[PDB]
């Protein structure tokens with residue numbers, strides 16, 4: 599099936615906890631995969647302007663590890679719950695993708711999660727000003743704008759609203775799309 603096929607593809611790129619004990623400032627993100635209308639989508643946030651870390655930006659749910667977290671996946675899940683109301687029973691963490699090194703002292707670990715079909719986002723306005731889906735296939739043929747660096751523009755056909763997706767978030771979206779959608783019969 600579509601979902602078993604995605605999970606089987608993703609597991610081949612799992613690095614596990616290989617880089618998880620290194621002495622960095624540690625953050626995790628959740629790359630939430632949602633199946634709608636027979637296709638896979640990624641769930642994105644627009645972060646509140648009030649935040650210190652990446653205000654107003656399109657991002658994945660996530661944040662800084664704290665002492666309560668059993669592991670890096672727990673960080674991602676705790677933060678996704680705080681930001682969009684995603685509960686533990688509503689997500690299956692499938693793998694840990696290659697981490698992102700930044701600022702010389704920080705490691706951001708991405709986890710891909712399969713989201714239950716009855717989940718409905720409840721944006722927490724203290725954390726996020728918006729939550730939106732993008733079909734995974736978009737990232738194979740994105741609308742690119744050069745700001746010099748590459749920015750994606752996605753327009754939601756439901757309402758005509760345009761979102762700018764850039765940096766780490768854009769890079770990870772492309773990675774997940776390649777992993778799941780490459781070399782597929784029609």
Ligand SMILES: Cc1ccc(-c2ccccc2N2CCCC2=O)cc1
Pocket residue numbers: 625626627651652657658659660661662700701704706765766767
């Ligand atoms: C959810 C999340 C998780 C981590 C970070 C983050 C942390 C330390 C340095 C840079 C970071 N990043 C990544 C995307 C843009 C940005 O400012 C920001 C947001």
